[PDB]
Amino acid sequence: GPLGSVREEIESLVQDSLMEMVKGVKNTIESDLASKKGLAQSTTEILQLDPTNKAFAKSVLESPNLKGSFLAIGLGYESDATVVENDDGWEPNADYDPRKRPWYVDAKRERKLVVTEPYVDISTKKIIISIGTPVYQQSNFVGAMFYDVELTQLAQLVNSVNLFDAGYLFITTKDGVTIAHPNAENNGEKFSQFLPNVDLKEGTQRIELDGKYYLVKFAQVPSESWYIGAVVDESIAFAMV
Amino acid sequence: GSVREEIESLVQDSLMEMVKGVKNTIESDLASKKGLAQSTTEILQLDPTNKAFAKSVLESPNLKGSFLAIGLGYESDATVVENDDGWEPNADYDPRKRPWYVDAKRERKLVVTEPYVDISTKKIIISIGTPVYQQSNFVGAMFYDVELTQLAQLVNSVNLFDAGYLFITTKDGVTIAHPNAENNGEKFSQFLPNVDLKEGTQRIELDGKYYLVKFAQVPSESWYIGAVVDESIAFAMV
Ligand SMILES: NC(=[NH2+])NCCC[C@H](N)C(=O)O
Numbered sequence: 001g002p003l004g005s006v007r008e009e010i011e012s013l014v015q016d017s018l019m020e021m022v023k024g025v026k027n028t029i030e031s032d033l034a035s036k037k038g039l040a041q042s043t044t045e046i047l048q049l050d051p052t053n054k055a056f057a058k059s060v061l062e063s064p065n066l067k068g069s070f071l072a073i074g075l076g077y078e079s080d081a082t083v084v085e086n087d088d089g090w091e092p093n094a095d096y097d098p099r100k101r102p103w104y105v106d107a108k109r110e111r112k113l114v115v116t117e118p119y120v121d122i123s124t125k126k127i128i129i130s131i132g133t134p135v136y137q138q139s140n141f142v143g144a145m146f147y148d149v150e151l152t153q154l155a156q157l158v159n160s161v162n163l164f165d166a167g168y169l170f171i172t173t174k175d176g177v178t179i180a181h182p183n184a185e186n187n188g189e190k191f192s193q194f195l196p197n198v199d200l201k202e203g204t205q206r207i208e209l210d211g212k213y214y215l216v217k218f219a220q221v222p223s224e225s226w227y228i229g230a231v232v233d234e235s236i237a238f239a240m241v
Numbered sequence: 242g243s244v245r246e247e248i249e250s251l252v253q254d255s256l257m258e259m260v261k262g263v264k265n266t267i268e269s270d271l272a273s274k275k276g277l278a279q280s281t282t283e284i285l286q287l288d289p290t291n292k293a294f295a296k297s298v299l300e301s302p303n304l305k306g307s308f309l310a311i312g313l314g315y316e317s318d319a320t321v322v323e324n325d326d327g328w329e330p331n332a333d334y335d336p337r338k339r340p341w342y343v344d345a346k347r348e349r350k351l352v353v354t355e356p357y358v359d360i361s362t363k364k365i366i367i368s369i370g371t372p373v374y375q376q377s378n379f380v381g382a383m384f385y386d387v388e389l390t391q392l393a394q395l396v397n398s399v400n401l402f403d404a405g406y407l408f409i410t411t412k413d414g415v416t417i418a419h420p421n422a423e424n425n426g427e428k429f430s431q432f433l434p435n436v437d438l439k440e441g442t443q444r445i446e447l448d449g450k451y452y453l454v455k456f457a458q459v460p461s462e463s464w465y466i467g468a469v470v471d472e473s474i475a476f477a478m479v
């Protein structure tokens with residue numbers, strides 16, 4: 001056990017908290033996504049019993065349980081770029097082409113159910129992930145569907161945990177864009193503005209920022225390709241143990 | 242003694258682990274299936290009397306692949322719209338005298354039955370039961386059969402080093418999960434007499450052998466998780 005027996009206990013405790021958040025993120029988000037996946041899949045299959053029937057589509061997407069399980073649900077058509085949608089607070093722009101949206105492109109490309117990476121919603125302007133499913137009349141691609149999922153539980157998980165008064169946990173994208181933070185205004189920004197000179201990589205990093213010493217640990221969430229980050233002030237943490 | 246109390250401690254650890262495992266697999270499985278059964282019911286409420294529409298929806302691949310069997314019983318014709326390729330309701334089959342129907346009709350909402358023997362597959366199953374409405378008329382009820390195979394895997398995955406095993410019963414003591422599957426369907430007292438279906442620690446004597454029995458209740462259902470060990474064999478191992 002090399003130099004820093006109190007410093008290798010901090011690192012060990014941060015690793016403990018980091019691992020629980022990893023399991024914590026999986027046990028909430030992934031189990032929720034799995035539930036929402038099957039719901040989106042059945043909805044897609046039921047809808048292509050009569051895909052061009054947009055009245056039937058609106059009827060299904062206005063169904064209370066389905067309507068209350070997602071932020072918003074919609075269908076974009078290939079030929080028309082017509083959008084059937086169930087959000088009582090959103091209607092397409094003059095400029096809104098579904099066929100060039102991330103959930104659409106992914107669904108058409110994979111020819112199966114897809115999940116997008118965190119992007120900022122157009123109506124809500126919050127960062128969300130969307131469940132994308134392709135729609136087929138009968139082997140002919142007519143369009144794709146979006147099932148918006150707000151990352152609320154990520155905001156709750158991160159807020160709850162306090163790394164023994166020395167720091168906090170946070171979540172970024174694969175490109176280091178913050179999506180969950182105790183202070184929510186860091187969301188949408190690259191984590192380099194509140195935590196500069198830190199590489200987005202799994203493992204342990206130690207840096208000095210203007211007279212302060214910080215301990216940083218990153219872990220990945222393989223299924224959603226997110227990074228979970230842990231920061232503490234090593235000086236405060238050291239004296240505390 | 243201290244060693245006997247350690248055994249009781251280790252049995253409790255395995256017991257609590259199993260309770261957690263049931264909630265982390267079965268309950269999350271039910272949670273996902275309940276949301277699906279609820280959305281499926283409301284979709285069918287667009288045209289409840291449409292036999293063809295119901296059939297085509299119940300035959301949708303993902304929906305048909307997420308349940309053991311899905312059906313709709315009517316209050317009038319007593320007819321059934323089923324999606325089981327290998328079944329067809331006998332003349333003696335009345336949907337409205339089945340557990341899922343009465344429970345769903347009694348309640349305002351979606352319901353989950355106690356584990357019961359499937360009339361067709363003869364397996365032990367639970368059914369998600371929902372009411373079907375038109376104009377706010379009760380026009381019938383639906384069932385969503387769920388196999389309890391994930392219980393068998395949990396129960397079978399336990400290795401207590403020949404000292405004992407874990408088992409699951411209903412609130413009535415009817416075994417629905419056992420390392421010896423031949424005990425499923427019978428009351429647990431058939432192989433474990435003089436044990437009350439109560440939460441807590443019990444020590445019994447059976448055929449010159451001494452056993453330690455510990456029960457825990459799964460509150461969302463009413464299932465009891467049972468933990469049993471041969472105290473002599475347990476002493477031997479640890
Ligand atoms: N609730 C909404 N904002 N719906 C429309 C946008 C859907 C999806 N987030 C997109 O940008 O394509």
Ligand SMILES: NC(=[NH2+])NCCC[C@H](N)C(=O)O
Pocket residue numbers: 309310325328339340359360361362368384386
């Ligand atoms: N797999 C089946 N065939 N299920 C239909 C018969 C049994 C069903 N649980 C009921 O009592 O309604």
Ligand SMILES: [Ca+2]
Pocket residue numbers: 085086087088089090091
């Ligand atoms: Ca709207």
Ligand SMILES: [Ca+2]
Pocket residue numbers: 323324325326327328329
């Ligand atoms: Ca049939």
